[PDB]
Amino acid sequence: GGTILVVTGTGTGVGKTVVCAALASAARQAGIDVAVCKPVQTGTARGDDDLAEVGRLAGVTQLAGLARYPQPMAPAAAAEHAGMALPARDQIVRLIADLDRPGRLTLVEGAGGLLVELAEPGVTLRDVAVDVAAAALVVVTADLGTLNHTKLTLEALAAQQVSCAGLVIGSWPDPPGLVAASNRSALARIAMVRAALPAGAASLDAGDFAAMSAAAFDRNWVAGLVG
Amino acid sequence: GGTILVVTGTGTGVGKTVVCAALASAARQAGIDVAVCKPVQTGTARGDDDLAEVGRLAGVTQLAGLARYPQPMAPAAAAEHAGMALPARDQIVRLIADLDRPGRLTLVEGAGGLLVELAEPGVTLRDVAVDVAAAALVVVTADLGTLNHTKLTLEALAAQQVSCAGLVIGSWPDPPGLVAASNRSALARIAMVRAALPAGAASLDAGDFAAMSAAAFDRNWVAGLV
Ligand SMILES: O=C(O)C(C(=O)O)[C@@H]1CCC[C@H]1C(=O)c1ccc(-c2nnn[nH]2)cc1
Numbered sequence: 001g002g003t004i005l006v007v008t009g010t011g012t013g014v015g016k017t018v019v020c021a022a023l024a025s026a027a028r029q030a031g032i033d034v035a036v037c038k039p040v041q042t043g044t045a046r047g048d049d050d051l052a053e054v055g056r057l058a059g060v061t062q063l064a065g066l067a068r069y070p071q072p073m074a075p076a077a078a079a080e081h082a083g084m085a086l087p088a089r090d091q092i093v094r095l096i097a098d099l100d101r102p103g104r105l106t107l108v109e110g111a112g113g114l115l116v117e118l119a120e121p122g123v124t125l126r127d128v129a130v131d132v133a134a135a136a137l138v139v140v141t142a143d144l145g146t147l148n149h150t151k152l153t154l155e156a157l158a159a160q161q162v163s164c165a166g167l168v169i170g171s172w173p174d175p176p177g178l179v180a181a182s183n184r185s186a187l188a189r190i191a192m193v194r195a196a197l198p199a200g201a202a203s204l205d206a207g208d209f210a211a212m213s214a215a216a217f218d219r220n221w222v223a224g225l226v227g
Numbered sequence: 228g229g230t231i232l233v234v235t236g237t238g239t240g241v242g243k244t245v246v247c248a249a250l251a252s253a254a255r256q257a258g259i260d261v262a263v264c265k266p267v268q269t270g271t272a273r274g275d276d277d278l279a280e281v282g283r284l285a286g287v288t289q290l291a292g293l294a295r296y297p298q299p300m301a302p303a304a305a306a307e308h309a310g311m312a313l314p315a316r317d318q319i320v321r322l323i324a325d326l327d328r329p330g331r332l333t334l335v336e337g338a339g340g341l342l343v344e345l346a347e348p349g350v351t352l353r354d355v356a357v358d359v360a361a362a363a364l365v366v367v368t369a370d371l372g373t374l375n376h377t378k379l380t381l382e383a384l385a386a387q388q389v390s391c392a393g394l395v396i397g398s399w400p401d402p403p404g405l406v407a408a409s410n411r412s413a414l415a416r417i418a419m420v421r422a423a424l425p426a427g428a429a430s431l432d433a434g435d436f437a438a439m440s441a442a443a444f445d446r447n448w449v450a451g452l453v
């Protein structure tokens with residue numbers, strides 16, 4: 001196949017979707033074919049639709065979903081509230097495997113953070129990453145508390161031998177305060193920081209988002225993801 | 228000795244100090260002698276002094292600490308900003324062991340969450356809990372995202388064979404809401420929920436806080452701690 005990369009985060013609202021869009025944009029500009037999938041999407045009754053947002057920001061057309069739940073809650077709770085079931089583990093894996101292809105970067109966007117239940121019983125994006133032999137890109141904030149959450153998430157990845165592809169700061173303030181600057185230096189001692197997306201990136205138009213994305217990542221790292 | 232419990236949280240600002248105070252108050256009312264140790268405290272420039280708050284809310288007098296940094300930052304960053312090192316691992320472990328005594332509940336309050344560096348070099352409250360053979364009480368929120376952070380923290384405790392003494396919800400909203408209610412049910416599927424402190428409890432006077440605390444915890448669990 002190609003390269004499968006799960007995109008997780010330290011939590012919800014940390015920048016998973018905009019990072020997915022930014023990496024997708026950078027890879028497409030490098031001539032890499034990109035697919036993005038969001039196997040579990042909650043909050044659809046609030047307008048949450050991460051695949052649509054990635055298409056809007058990055059131009060990705062190869063978008064794949066599976067489960068959609070109305071309430072903006074954790075998947076298990078949103079499914080319960082809608083009277084629906086979570087997907088099965090093998091259904092999530094099938095979605096991803098159908099996309100995987102030599103030369104293609106397939107990004108698998110999680111729901112919330114790494115240990116959120118996506119399938120019964122207690123199957124998480126970590127388990128899915130093992131099934132499809134994917135590394136994990138971890139989206140983090142620059143805010144107070146990020147170092148603890150990042151180290152917790154990386155330890156959890158290592159516990160199941162899921163390689164960490166690096167960190168991305170989802171929103172980087174301009175100018176940075178003392179806490180944000182300190183956190184960025186400390187994050188870079190824990191793992192490679194692949195990018196720090198400028199605050200407000202999700203509000204850029206298509207052309208400005210593309211330029212931001214190309215400058216945000218190291219071109220050699222993006223090109224090295226897919227042979 | 229007695230019973231040592233580290234009191235950690237899924238992060239910072241989740242209610243660790245008020246939970247320390249609440250458990251201390253419930254234990255004191257059960258006739259248990261209580262000490263509270265906050266080895267490292269930051270944010271003292273704006274007035275943060277968690278030991279003073281525990282003393283006022285719960286009446287604890289054995290209040291022990293080693294280091295206080297003015298800036299409201301992670302300990303390592305606050306120490307770097309001040310140009311001074313964090314305390315030594317030996318200082319923290321020995322202070323706690325010295326506080327511990329038969330018939331006493333010694334609560335050790337961390338700074339931020341479980342994997343925060345408290346001593347040089349890279350020593351955390353988890354490492355301290357291993358050294359003094361303490362179980363860990365985990366303070367969690369009721370808010371969106373709490374389940375992931377709680378599961379991550381519990382996995383990290385288990386990875387170094389630190390027993391989990393349960394969870395405490397640091398602030399229970401009024402009215403709760405669908406997410407808070409769902410999270411409270413889900414948290415109980417992960418570990419014992421020992422208490423859920425009403426929102427605003429940190430503003431109570433000592434008498435009102437004691438009444439809140441005694442009702443918040445199961446009296447049999449508190450008495451069983453020592
Ligand atoms: O949480 C506590 O104890 C607080 C309290 O004393 O009230 C402290 C108040 C000032 C900062 C906070 C702290 O100490 C802290 C802040 C951020 C981090 C962190 N972790 N990962 N990234 N940053 C760790 C600790």
Ligand SMILES: O=C(O)C(C(=O)O)[C@@H]1CCC[C@H]1C(=O)c1ccc(-c2nnn[nH]2)cc1
Nearest residue numbers: 012013043072073074111112372373374375
């Ligand atoms: O974060 C994402 O993916 C968001 C997105 O679709 O962009 C989703 C928007 C709606 C909810 C959020 C989600 O899916 C979610 C929310 C809370 C939790 C949780 N974890 N622990 N306790 N609660 C887990 C997932």
